[PDB]
Amino acid sequence: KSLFRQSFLFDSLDLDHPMVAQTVRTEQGVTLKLHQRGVLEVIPAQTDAATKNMVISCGIHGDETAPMELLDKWIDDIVSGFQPVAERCLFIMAHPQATVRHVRFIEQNLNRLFDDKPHTPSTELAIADNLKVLLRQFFANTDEHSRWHLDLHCAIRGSKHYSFAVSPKARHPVRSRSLMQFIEQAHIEAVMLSNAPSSTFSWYSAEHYAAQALTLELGQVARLGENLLDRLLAFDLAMRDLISRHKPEHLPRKSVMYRVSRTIVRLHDDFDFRFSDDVENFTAFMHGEVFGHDGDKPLMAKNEGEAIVFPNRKVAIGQRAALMVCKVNTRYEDDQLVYD
């Protein structure tokens, strides 16, 4: 069709050339309201009642490119019909500029400026504010029982689990049975249940809309292309089934259920760990080992297996260094996920 010019992905990564909004119905009945650079909406050719309003977003960062190509392709197949629709979904490609500049972020980590707390005027902060509208405008007259929000990212480094999900800690019930099943069909190797609030785009959706929201870190941060989508095969199929609302055709596989044990926010300057960079996510520790002191009070595995995640080095005295995690056994209680 004539809604794009080459690809939602590249027609969004094109600075000099501005893509204006333009709404167009497709042969199959799928209505595509394009809004602004990196923002495409889609509605079912019937729009029943039990339909879902999903927000699949990519590019919150800049390095993470694997989701974009997959998102980039899903679009292609929705216009060409190769891919059927069945759920009102907004395809966000926030912060394109950074993806072009090949960097993680312009000024500050965008996925940290979504809380109600005030922040300093920053490029990323401009975008955050914007996104919040999109969500406001999108979840209009809708019902939480049908709200989904999947933020797609990539691992800032290695990891024992190629890809894993990060459920937010919201005041509402945001860990449904259907949200689990999706993760399984995606064959996501691990799930991290956040223990406290945040300011990630995902968290924001759950906390202010009660939407089953996740942040999936699929594979690592390879250069646009390198990303071996081959590995993101289950995920790629899963999503398609998610928007097509039909036949979950391949076999799923339970994921290792984890629980944020505590955050390791840095506070002093004489900070140090027991590893370099070759430290993969989920690197478990026994009751006896310390992964690096802190000049004041040391640091060891409170539990037997307390694995670490997000081992940041650029950590500030205020930011959070890593994250602890303990393998927890789950269950359900009226369609919701609970532990112990």
mmCIF file of C-alpha atoms in Angstrom:
data_model
loop_
_atom_site.group_PDB
_atom_site.id
_atom_site.type_symbol
_atom_site.label_atom_id
_atom_site.label_comp_id
_atom_site.label_asym_id
_atom_site.label_seq_id
_atom_site.Cartn_x
_atom_site.Cartn_y
_atom_site.Cartn_z
ATOM 1 C CA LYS A 1 0.000 0.000 0.000
ATOM 2 C CA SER A 2 0.897 3.722 0.090
ATOM 3 C CA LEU A 3 0.863 4.231 3.882
ATOM 4 C CA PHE A 4 4.636 3.855 4.287
ATOM 5 C CA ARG A 5 7.480 4.213 1.806
ATOM 6 C CA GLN A 6 9.958 1.422 2.571
ATOM 7 C CA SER A 7 9.345 0.122 6.121
ATOM 8 C CA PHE A 8 7.702 1.334 9.352
ATOM 9 C CA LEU A 9 11.167 0.746 10.796
ATOM 10 C CA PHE A 10 13.186 2.770 8.281
ATOM 11 C CA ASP A 11 10.447 5.315 7.474
ATOM 12 C CA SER A 12 10.735 6.070 11.180
ATOM 13 C CA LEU A 13 14.501 6.131 11.272
ATOM 14 C CA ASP A 14 14.535 8.770 8.555
ATOM 15 C CA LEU A 15 15.193 12.219 10.068
ATOM 16 C CA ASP A 16 15.399 14.429 6.952
ATOM 17 C CA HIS A 17 12.161 12.885 5.656
ATOM 18 C CA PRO A 18 9.096 13.413 7.920
ATOM 19 C CA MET A 19 6.328 10.850 7.635
ATOM 20 C CA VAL A 20 2.956 12.521 8.156
ATOM 21 C CA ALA A 21 -0.010 10.775 9.721
ATOM 22 C CA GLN A 22 -2.374 8.873 7.415
ATOM 23 C CA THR A 23 -5.218 6.476 8.159
ATOM 24 C CA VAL A 24 -5.879 3.651 5.644
ATOM 25 C CA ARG A 25 -8.233 0.607 5.507
ATOM 26 C CA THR A 26 -6.671 -2.582 4.118
ATOM 27 C CA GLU A 27 -8.056 -5.193 1.768
ATOM 28 C CA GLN A 28 -8.778 -7.490 4.729
ATOM 29 C CA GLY A 29 -10.606 -4.710 6.608
ATOM 30 C CA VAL A 30 -7.719 -3.803 8.923
ATOM 31 C CA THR A 31 -7.778 -0.053 9.623
ATOM 32 C CA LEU A 32 -4.278 1.491 10.025
ATOM 33 C CA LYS A 33 -4.284 4.928 11.667
ATOM 34 C CA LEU A 34 -0.685 6.155 11.429
ATOM 35 C CA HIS A 35 -0.164 8.946 13.935
ATOM 36 C CA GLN A 36 3.386 10.248 14.149
ATOM 37 C CA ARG A 37 6.986 9.234 13.593
ATOM 38 C CA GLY A 38 7.224 5.708 15.038
ATOM 39 C CA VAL A 39 3.583 5.357 16.023
ATOM 40 C CA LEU A 40 1.168 3.038 14.174
ATOM 41 C CA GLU A 41 -2.314 1.959 15.388
ATOM 42 C CA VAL A 42 -4.349 -1.065 14.242
ATOM 43 C CA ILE A 43 -7.973 -2.118 14.656
ATOM 44 C CA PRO A 44 -9.818 -5.434 14.085
ATOM 45 C CA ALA A 45 -12.142 -5.643 11.087
ATOM 46 C CA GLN A 46 -15.040 -6.150 13.509
ATOM 47 C CA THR A 47 -13.848 -4.980 16.902
ATOM 48 C CA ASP A 48 -15.901 -7.392 19.022
ATOM 49 C CA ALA A 49 -16.071 -7.102 22.822
ATOM 50 C CA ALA A 50 -13.536 -9.533 24.255
ATOM 51 C CA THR A 51 -10.998 -7.885 21.968
ATOM 52 C CA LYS A 52 -7.763 -6.743 23.552
ATOM 53 C CA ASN A 53 -6.002 -3.380 23.418
ATOM 54 C CA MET A 54 -2.341 -4.156 23.336
ATOM 55 C CA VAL A 55 0.607 -1.799 23.293
ATOM 56 C CA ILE A 56 3.625 -3.540 21.776
ATOM 57 C CA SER A 57 6.509 -1.084 22.019
ATOM 58 C CA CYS A 58 10.107 -1.147 20.912
ATOM 59 C CA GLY A 59 13.111 1.089 20.929
ATOM 60 C CA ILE A 60 12.645 2.466 24.432
ATOM 61 C CA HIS A 61 16.440 2.285 24.293
ATOM 62 C CA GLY A 62 18.706 2.589 21.221
ATOM 63 C CA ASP A 63 21.069 -0.408 21.278
ATOM 64 C CA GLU A 64 18.258 -2.984 21.374
ATOM 65 C CA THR A 65 17.426 -3.587 17.702
ATOM 66 C CA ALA A 66 16.209 -7.213 17.519
ATOM 67 C CA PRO A 67 12.629 -6.274 18.489
ATOM 68 C CA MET A 68 12.391 -3.591 15.835
ATOM 69 C CA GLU A 69 13.064 -5.961 12.915
ATOM 70 C CA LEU A 70 10.503 -8.385 14.275
ATOM 71 C CA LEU A 71 8.051 -5.571 14.901
ATOM 72 C CA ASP A 72 9.099 -4.177 11.543
ATOM 73 C CA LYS A 73 8.134 -7.451 9.863
ATOM 74 C CA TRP A 74 4.818 -7.967 11.695
ATOM 75 C CA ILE A 75 3.668 -4.678 10.231
ATOM 76 C CA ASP A 76 4.710 -5.673 6.735
ATOM 77 C CA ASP A 77 2.561 -8.799 6.987
ATOM 78 C CA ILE A 78 -0.447 -6.978 8.398
ATOM 79 C CA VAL A 79 -0.685 -4.686 5.413
ATOM 80 C CA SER A 80 -0.043 -7.526 2.952
ATOM 81 C CA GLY A 81 -2.493 -9.774 4.807
ATOM 82 C CA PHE A 82 0.275 -12.368 5.257
ATOM 83 C CA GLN A 83 -0.583 -11.627 8.929
ATOM 84 C CA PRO A 84 -4.252 -11.413 10.125
ATOM 85 C CA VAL A 85 -5.417 -8.998 12.886
ATOM 86 C CA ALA A 86 -7.833 -9.337 15.793
ATOM 87 C CA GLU A 87 -6.747 -6.886 18.437
ATOM 88 C CA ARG A 88 -6.602 -3.116 18.619
ATOM 89 C CA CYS A 89 -2.838 -2.578 19.012
ATOM 90 C CA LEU A 90 -0.520 0.438 19.028
ATOM 91 C CA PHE A 91 2.967 -0.258 17.631
ATOM 92 C CA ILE A 92 5.290 2.177 19.342
ATOM 93 C CA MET A 93 8.801 2.869 18.126
ATOM 94 C CA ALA A 94 9.662 5.582 20.637
ATOM 95 C CA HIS A 95 13.032 7.324 20.622
ATOM 96 C CA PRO A 96 14.056 6.687 17.011
ATOM 97 C CA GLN A 97 16.812 9.301 17.028
ATOM 98 C CA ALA A 98 18.895 7.240 19.461
ATOM 99 C CA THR A 99 18.488 4.049 17.447
ATOM 100 C CA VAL A 100 20.006 6.029 14.555
ATOM 101 C CA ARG A 101 22.796 7.530 16.612
ATOM 102 C CA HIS A 102 23.623 3.908 17.486
ATOM 103 C CA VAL A 103 23.643 4.706 21.205
ATOM 104 C CA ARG A 104 21.846 3.385 24.281
ATOM 105 C CA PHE A 105 20.455 6.850 24.973
ATOM 106 C CA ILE A 106 20.899 10.539 24.206
ATOM 107 C CA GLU A 107 21.035 12.050 27.679
ATOM 108 C CA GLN A 108 19.410 9.783 30.260
ATOM 109 C CA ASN A 109 18.016 6.232 30.267
ATOM 110 C CA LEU A 110 14.521 6.988 28.923
ATOM 111 C CA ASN A 111 13.066 3.937 30.618
ATOM 112 C CA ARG A 112 13.374 5.536 34.020
ATOM 113 C CA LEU A 113 11.501 8.780 33.505
ATOM 114 C CA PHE A 114 7.896 7.518 33.724
ATOM 115 C CA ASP A 115 7.081 7.880 37.425
ATOM 116 C CA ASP A 116 5.081 10.779 38.875
ATOM 117 C CA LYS A 117 8.281 12.080 40.493
ATOM 118 C CA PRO A 118 9.697 15.124 38.611
ATOM 119 C CA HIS A 119 12.903 14.929 36.529
ATOM 120 C CA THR A 120 15.383 17.337 34.899
ATOM 121 C CA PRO A 121 14.678 18.650 31.353
ATOM 122 C CA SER A 122 16.138 15.965 29.119
ATOM 123 C CA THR A 123 15.699 14.768 25.530
ATOM 124 C CA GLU A 124 14.461 11.398 26.789
ATOM 125 C CA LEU A 125 12.185 13.164 29.303
ATOM 126 C CA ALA A 126 10.487 14.970 26.416
ATOM 127 C CA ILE A 127 9.657 11.627 24.847
ATOM 128 C CA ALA A 128 8.491 10.090 28.107
ATOM 129 C CA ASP A 129 5.908 12.808 28.624
ATOM 130 C CA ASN A 130 4.780 12.219 25.060
ATOM 131 C CA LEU A 131 4.360 8.487 25.412
ATOM 132 C CA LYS A 132 2.131 9.047 28.484
ATOM 133 C CA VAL A 133 -0.351 10.827 26.211
ATOM 134 C CA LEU A 134 -0.327 8.047 23.646
ATOM 135 C CA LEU A 135 -1.275 5.666 26.446
ATOM 136 C CA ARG A 136 -3.908 8.109 27.724
ATOM 137 C CA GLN A 137 -5.345 8.591 24.219
ATOM 138 C CA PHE A 138 -5.156 4.864 23.491
ATOM 139 C CA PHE A 139 -6.739 3.350 26.597
ATOM 140 C CA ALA A 140 -9.762 5.545 26.011
ATOM 141 C CA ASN A 141 -13.177 4.105 26.855
ATOM 142 C CA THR A 142 -11.396 0.760 27.091
ATOM 143 C CA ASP A 143 -11.471 -1.802 29.884
ATOM 144 C CA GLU A 144 -8.511 -2.980 31.938
ATOM 145 C CA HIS A 145 -9.601 -6.603 31.559
ATOM 146 C CA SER A 146 -8.435 -6.262 27.943
ATOM 147 C CA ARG A 147 -5.351 -4.076 28.296
ATOM 148 C CA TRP A 148 -1.918 -5.392 27.441
ATOM 149 C CA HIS A 149 1.450 -3.750 27.234
ATOM 150 C CA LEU A 150 4.573 -5.468 25.962
ATOM 151 C CA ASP A 151 7.768 -3.440 26.021
ATOM 152 C CA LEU A 152 10.424 -5.208 23.912
ATOM 153 C CA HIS A 153 14.131 -4.844 24.685
ATOM 154 C CA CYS A 154 17.477 -6.594 24.636
ATOM 155 C CA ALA A 155 20.051 -7.650 27.194
ATOM 156 C CA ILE A 156 22.677 -4.972 27.872
ATOM 157 C CA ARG A 157 25.041 -7.970 28.289
ATOM 158 C CA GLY A 158 25.195 -11.770 28.579
ATOM 159 C CA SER A 159 22.706 -13.864 30.578
ATOM 160 C CA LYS A 160 22.144 -17.490 31.728
ATOM 161 C CA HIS A 161 18.725 -17.093 30.188
ATOM 162 C CA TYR A 162 18.732 -15.801 26.599
ATOM 163 C CA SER A 163 15.515 -13.859 27.126
ATOM 164 C CA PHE A 164 13.412 -13.194 30.227
ATOM 165 C CA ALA A 165 10.344 -11.161 31.218
ATOM 166 C CA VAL A 166 10.013 -8.502 33.907
ATOM 167 C CA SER A 167 6.573 -8.194 35.494
ATOM 168 C CA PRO A 168 5.965 -4.840 37.231
ATOM 169 C CA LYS A 169 4.854 -4.398 40.811
ATOM 170 C CA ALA A 170 1.567 -2.551 40.388
ATOM 171 C CA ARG A 171 -1.285 -1.824 42.810
ATOM 172 C CA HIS A 172 -3.564 -3.848 40.520
ATOM 173 C CA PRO A 173 -3.540 -7.569 39.488
ATOM 174 C CA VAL A 174 -1.153 -7.486 36.594
ATOM 175 C CA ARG A 175 0.041 -11.063 36.453
ATOM 176 C CA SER A 176 -2.787 -12.957 34.756
ATOM 177 C CA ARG A 177 -2.928 -16.571 33.632
ATOM 178 C CA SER A 178 -3.193 -15.421 30.012
ATOM 179 C CA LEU A 179 -0.173 -13.204 30.436
ATOM 180 C CA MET A 180 1.747 -16.242 31.685
ATOM 181 C CA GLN A 181 0.608 -18.470 28.874
ATOM 182 C CA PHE A 182 1.838 -15.873 26.428
ATOM 183 C CA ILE A 183 5.285 -15.843 27.983
ATOM 184 C CA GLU A 184 5.325 -19.646 27.808
ATOM 185 C CA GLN A 185 4.308 -19.793 24.157
ATOM 186 C CA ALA A 186 7.051 -17.289 23.552
ATOM 187 C CA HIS A 187 9.341 -19.789 25.249
ATOM 188 C CA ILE A 188 10.747 -16.939 27.320
ATOM 189 C CA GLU A 189 13.366 -18.664 29.397
ATOM 190 C CA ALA A 190 12.900 -16.638 32.603
ATOM 191 C CA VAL A 191 10.446 -14.427 34.438
ATOM 192 C CA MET A 192 11.414 -11.799 37.007
ATOM 193 C CA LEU A 193 8.659 -10.626 39.301
ATOM 194 C CA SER A 194 9.577 -7.092 40.355
ATOM 195 C CA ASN A 195 9.398 -6.547 44.124
ATOM 196 C CA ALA A 196 8.895 -2.758 44.107
ATOM 197 C CA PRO A 197 7.663 0.104 41.925
ATOM 198 C CA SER A 198 9.786 1.602 39.183
ATOM 199 C CA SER A 199 9.532 4.088 36.320
ATOM 200 C CA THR A 200 9.878 1.824 33.308
ATOM 201 C CA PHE A 201 7.378 2.205 30.500
ATOM 202 C CA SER A 202 5.981 -1.202 31.379
ATOM 203 C CA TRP A 203 5.454 -0.391 35.069
ATOM 204 C CA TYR A 204 3.706 2.796 34.027
ATOM 205 C CA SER A 205 1.077 0.888 32.054
ATOM 206 C CA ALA A 206 0.271 -1.528 34.881
ATOM 207 C CA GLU A 207 0.222 1.118 37.595
ATOM 208 C CA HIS A 208 -2.011 3.651 35.857
ATOM 209 C CA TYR A 209 -4.180 1.326 33.726
ATOM 210 C CA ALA A 210 -4.067 -2.110 35.321
ATOM 211 C CA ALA A 211 -2.726 -3.616 32.093
ATOM 212 C CA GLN A 212 -0.973 -6.999 31.860
ATOM 213 C CA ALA A 213 2.403 -5.446 31.144
ATOM 214 C CA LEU A 214 5.817 -6.836 30.556
ATOM 215 C CA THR A 215 9.231 -5.872 29.459
ATOM 216 C CA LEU A 216 10.892 -8.658 27.580
ATOM 217 C CA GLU A 217 14.652 -8.590 27.200
ATOM 218 C CA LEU A 218 15.071 -10.912 24.197
ATOM 219 C CA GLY A 219 18.664 -11.896 23.493
ATOM 220 C CA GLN A 220 21.469 -9.350 23.744
ATOM 221 C CA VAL A 221 22.076 -5.951 22.152
ATOM 222 C CA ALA A 222 23.492 -6.764 18.727
ATOM 223 C CA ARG A 223 23.851 -4.275 15.880
ATOM 224 C CA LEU A 224 20.739 -3.797 13.708
ATOM 225 C CA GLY A 225 20.796 -7.062 11.808
ATOM 226 C CA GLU A 226 23.186 -9.309 13.768
ATOM 227 C CA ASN A 227 20.221 -10.092 16.041
ATOM 228 C CA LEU A 228 19.672 -13.755 15.256
ATOM 229 C CA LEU A 229 15.909 -13.653 14.931
ATOM 230 C CA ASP A 230 16.286 -17.415 14.547
ATOM 231 C CA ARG A 231 16.482 -17.581 18.316
ATOM 232 C CA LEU A 232 13.467 -15.253 18.616
ATOM 233 C CA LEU A 233 11.472 -17.779 16.638
ATOM 234 C CA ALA A 234 9.132 -18.838 19.425
ATOM 235 C CA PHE A 235 8.692 -15.267 20.468
ATOM 236 C CA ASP A 236 8.009 -14.136 16.916
ATOM 237 C CA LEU A 237 5.361 -16.816 16.423
ATOM 238 C CA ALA A 238 3.859 -16.146 19.837
ATOM 239 C CA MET A 239 3.260 -12.452 19.164
ATOM 240 C CA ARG A 240 1.638 -13.234 15.844
ATOM 241 C CA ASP A 241 -0.738 -15.587 17.590
ATOM 242 C CA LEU A 242 -1.292 -12.839 20.180
ATOM 243 C CA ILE A 243 -2.488 -10.256 17.669
ATOM 244 C CA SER A 244 -4.244 -12.819 15.410
ATOM 245 C CA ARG A 245 -6.074 -14.137 18.494
ATOM 246 C CA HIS A 246 -6.040 -17.579 16.970
ATOM 247 C CA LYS A 247 -4.592 -21.063 17.112
ATOM 248 C CA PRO A 248 -1.565 -21.306 19.401
ATOM 249 C CA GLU A 249 0.124 -23.772 16.987
ATOM 250 C CA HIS A 250 3.459 -24.762 18.629
ATOM 251 C CA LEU A 251 4.367 -26.348 21.996
ATOM 252 C CA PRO A 252 5.120 -23.986 24.939
ATOM 253 C CA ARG A 253 7.533 -24.465 27.842
ATOM 254 C CA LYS A 254 7.325 -23.372 31.477
ATOM 255 C CA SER A 255 9.687 -20.556 32.463
ATOM 256 C CA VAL A 256 11.905 -20.303 35.535
ATOM 257 C CA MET A 257 9.954 -18.177 38.020
ATOM 258 C CA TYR A 258 12.135 -15.608 39.806
ATOM 259 C CA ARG A 259 11.497 -12.960 42.420
ATOM 260 C CA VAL A 260 13.269 -9.669 42.945
ATOM 261 C CA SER A 261 14.973 -10.280 46.274
ATOM 262 C CA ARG A 262 16.208 -6.735 46.741
ATOM 263 C CA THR A 263 17.874 -3.918 44.836
ATOM 264 C CA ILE A 264 21.574 -3.117 45.243
ATOM 265 C CA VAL A 265 21.508 0.693 44.956
ATOM 266 C CA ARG A 266 24.996 2.185 45.196
ATOM 267 C CA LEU A 267 25.563 4.819 47.879
ATOM 268 C CA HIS A 268 29.295 5.251 48.309
ATOM 269 C CA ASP A 269 32.260 5.632 45.972
ATOM 270 C CA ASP A 270 34.477 2.766 47.075
ATOM 271 C CA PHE A 271 32.203 0.393 45.146
ATOM 272 C CA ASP A 272 33.383 -2.888 43.579
ATOM 273 C CA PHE A 273 32.147 -6.342 42.492
ATOM 274 C CA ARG A 274 33.766 -9.798 42.213
ATOM 275 C CA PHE A 275 33.489 -9.902 38.438
ATOM 276 C CA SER A 276 34.408 -7.975 35.296
ATOM 277 C CA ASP A 277 31.894 -7.847 32.458
ATOM 278 C CA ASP A 278 31.901 -11.534 31.592
ATOM 279 C CA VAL A 279 29.332 -11.711 34.410
ATOM 280 C CA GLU A 280 26.089 -13.012 32.926
ATOM 281 C CA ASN A 281 22.651 -12.239 34.322
ATOM 282 C CA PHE A 282 21.314 -14.731 36.870
ATOM 283 C CA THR A 283 24.798 -15.591 38.142
ATOM 284 C CA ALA A 284 23.856 -17.456 41.322
ATOM 285 C CA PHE A 285 25.854 -17.270 44.521
ATOM 286 C CA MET A 286 26.023 -19.579 47.539
ATOM 287 C CA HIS A 287 25.777 -18.870 51.252
ATOM 288 C CA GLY A 288 29.439 -17.962 51.754
ATOM 289 C CA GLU A 289 30.533 -15.893 48.760
ATOM 290 C CA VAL A 290 30.628 -12.126 48.362
ATOM 291 C CA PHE A 291 30.396 -10.485 44.923
ATOM 292 C CA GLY A 292 32.209 -7.311 45.944
ATOM 293 C CA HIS A 293 32.370 -5.085 49.031
ATOM 294 C CA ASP A 294 31.399 -1.419 49.330
ATOM 295 C CA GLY A 295 34.136 0.210 51.402
ATOM 296 C CA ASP A 296 31.581 0.354 54.215
ATOM 297 C CA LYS A 297 29.347 -2.736 54.276
ATOM 298 C CA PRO A 298 30.246 -5.740 52.027
ATOM 299 C CA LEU A 299 27.939 -7.709 49.724
ATOM 300 C CA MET A 300 27.133 -11.474 49.650
ATOM 301 C CA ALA A 301 24.324 -13.865 48.646
ATOM 302 C CA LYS A 302 21.770 -13.605 51.445
ATOM 303 C CA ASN A 303 20.414 -16.958 50.141
ATOM 304 C CA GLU A 304 21.762 -20.123 48.526
ATOM 305 C CA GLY A 305 21.437 -19.261 44.877
ATOM 306 C CA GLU A 306 20.548 -15.588 45.150
ATOM 307 C CA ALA A 307 21.328 -14.751 41.521
ATOM 308 C CA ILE A 308 22.217 -11.250 40.322
ATOM 309 C CA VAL A 309 20.788 -9.254 37.432
ATOM 310 C CA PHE A 310 21.485 -5.961 35.601
ATOM 311 C CA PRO A 311 25.093 -5.763 36.889
ATOM 312 C CA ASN A 312 25.559 -2.113 35.935
ATOM 313 C CA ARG A 313 28.978 -0.494 36.266
ATOM 314 C CA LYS A 314 27.993 3.028 35.209
ATOM 315 C CA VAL A 315 26.000 2.963 38.464
ATOM 316 C CA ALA A 316 25.688 6.268 40.302
ATOM 317 C CA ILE A 317 25.522 6.879 44.065
ATOM 318 C CA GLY A 318 21.756 7.206 43.609
ATOM 319 C CA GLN A 319 20.988 4.751 40.819
ATOM 320 C CA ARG A 320 20.654 1.045 41.462
ATOM 321 C CA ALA A 321 23.624 -1.192 40.766
ATOM 322 C CA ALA A 322 22.191 -4.687 40.353
ATOM 323 C CA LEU A 323 19.171 -6.789 41.324
ATOM 324 C CA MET A 324 18.884 -9.943 43.383
ATOM 325 C CA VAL A 325 16.632 -12.848 42.486
ATOM 326 C CA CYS A 326 15.504 -16.115 44.108
ATOM 327 C CA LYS A 327 13.831 -18.979 42.324
ATOM 328 C CA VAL A 328 10.270 -19.034 43.676
ATOM 329 C CA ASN A 329 7.511 -21.634 43.236
ATOM 330 C CA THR A 330 4.263 -20.181 41.916
ATOM 331 C CA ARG A 331 0.566 -21.066 41.600
ATOM 332 C CA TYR A 332 -2.735 -19.382 40.677
ATOM 333 C CA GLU A 333 -5.542 -17.767 42.668
ATOM 334 C CA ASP A 334 -8.495 -16.926 40.482
ATOM 335 C CA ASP A 335 -6.528 -16.436 37.249
ATOM 336 C CA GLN A 336 -3.691 -14.534 38.929
ATOM 337 C CA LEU A 337 -0.096 -15.501 39.586
ATOM 338 C CA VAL A 338 1.157 -15.743 43.148
ATOM 339 C CA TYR A 339 4.240 -17.251 44.788
ATOM 340 C CA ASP A 340 5.489 -19.427 47.629
#
